């Protein structure tokens, strides 16, 4: 058929990869500040862990647009 089936996969892969890049950039510093707090005191564990998981929204929104394009294809 037409070339669109191919070129949709570029948009689909480009979306999830940049969202993964963005949340990785976030999680770097968040988890580095986290580990230093646990090394001070185990009482910080829960509040460090939820801060590390909060930036995952970014890659969920990447997977969202990837699966929308996969269903279009």
């Amino acid at each position: 058929g037409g070339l669109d089936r191919g070129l949709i996969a570029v948009g689909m892969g480009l979306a999830v990869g940049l969202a993964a890049l963005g949340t990785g950039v976030a999680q770097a510093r968040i988890g580095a500040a986290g580990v230093g707090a646990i090394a001070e005191d185990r009482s910080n564990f829960g509040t460090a862990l939820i801060f590390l998981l909060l930036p995952e929204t970014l890659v969920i929104f990447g997977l969202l647009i990837a699966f929308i394009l996969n269903g279009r294809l």
């Binding site: 510093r29 580095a32 500040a33 230093g36 001070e40």
Partner: protein
């Protein structure tokens, strides 16, 4: 290594410090009333009881708890940058230990300041068979104290003469290490501290007639080899020659007690100017230098109250 993480912790701590009103009231009190204020403020967490040694131990323990963890909270290049601010207690531990060992006094004769190193190091440095073994047990991967020591050991492999050499080597190395990294707030302050240090060194050597190149030290910004020489000889117009530089307020000084106060107020002002660096090292620098100014002012006010001195003997020392 992250100054966004560290400066958030430092901003919290910088919120809880003694106001100028605390000192302005405490100047008038009895020692029992001074101890009332001390017992209720943040210092009270280490107040064991009543008496001058108790007050000193409380101030030492709270400052050690509230400042001496900063190099441990960070790691990497931020640890290198912050560690340069706390080194004096480790120099004073080393040269106290070195004198005690050279004169043959027992380890129980030395009292150790809380510093950047753990107390087992100082015991093992006393026990150590030789100055090289001592330097090796002192060493940690970038700390300038141990590398200044291993530098002067080349020049003399034995005790006592090192006392003339260690501090001169160390203060140059601390200023060099700061120029060696991209932090403008630290660099220009430690340059000003080396200017101040050689400036008061020539002043206290005055009248001895020694060779100036033995006591001048490298890495200043506002004072130099020839001004240092003149100021060490019988000349004071060299203070009045200082203009534009922060040291220009030393114009008309002819006394070491006046000089000590002048330099102390200039360096506190220059350090307080570093708050303009909210995501760099100037913020932790200003915090450390305000906290130590608080501790010395609090210690001198406790002496005024305890021994019952005239207020007119203290009002000049506590003003800036």
């Amino acid at each position: 290594d992250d100054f966004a993480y560290l400066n958030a912790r430092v901003r919290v701590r910088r919120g809880t410090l003694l106001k100028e009103s605390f000192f302005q009231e405490a100047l008038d009190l009895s020692f029992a009333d001074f101890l009332r204020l001390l017992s209720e403020t943040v210092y009270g967490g280490e107040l064991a009881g009543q008496g001058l040694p108790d007050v000193d131990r409380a101030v030492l323990r709270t400052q050690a708890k509230l400042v001496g963890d900063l190099p441990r909270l960070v790691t990497g290049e931020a640890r290198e940058a912050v560690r340069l601010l706390l080194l004096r207690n480790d120099l004073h531990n080393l040269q106290a230990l070195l004198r005690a060992k050279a004169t043959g006094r027992p380890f129980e004769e030395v009292l150790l300041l809380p510093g950047t190193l753990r107390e087992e190091v100082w015991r093992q440095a006393y026990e150590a068979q030789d100055p090289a073994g001592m330097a090796q047990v002192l060493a940690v991967p970038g700390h300038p104290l141990a590398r200044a020591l291993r530098a002067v050991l080349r020049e003399t492999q034995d005790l006592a003469r090192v006392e003339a050499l260690l501090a001169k080597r160390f203060f140059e190395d601390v200023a060099k290490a700061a120029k060696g990294l991209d932090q403008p707030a630290l660099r220009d302050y430690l340059a000003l501290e080396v200017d101040a240090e050689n400036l008061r060194t020539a002043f206290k050597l005055q009248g001895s007639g020694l060779a100036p190149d033995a006591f001048f030290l490298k890495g200043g910004r506002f004072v130099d080899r020839v001004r240092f020489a003149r100021l060490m000889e019988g000349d004071y117009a060299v203070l009045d020659e200082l203009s534009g530089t922060p040291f220009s307020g030393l114009s008309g000084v002819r006394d070491l007690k006046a000089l000590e106060r002048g330099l102390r107020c200039v360096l506190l002002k220059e350090a307080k100017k570093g708050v303009q660096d909210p995501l760099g090292v100037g913020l932790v620098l200003a915090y450390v230098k305000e906290r130590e100014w608080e501790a010395v002012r609090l210690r001198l006010l406790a002496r005024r109250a305890y021994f019952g001195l005239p207020r007119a003997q203290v009002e000049e020392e506590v003003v800036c």
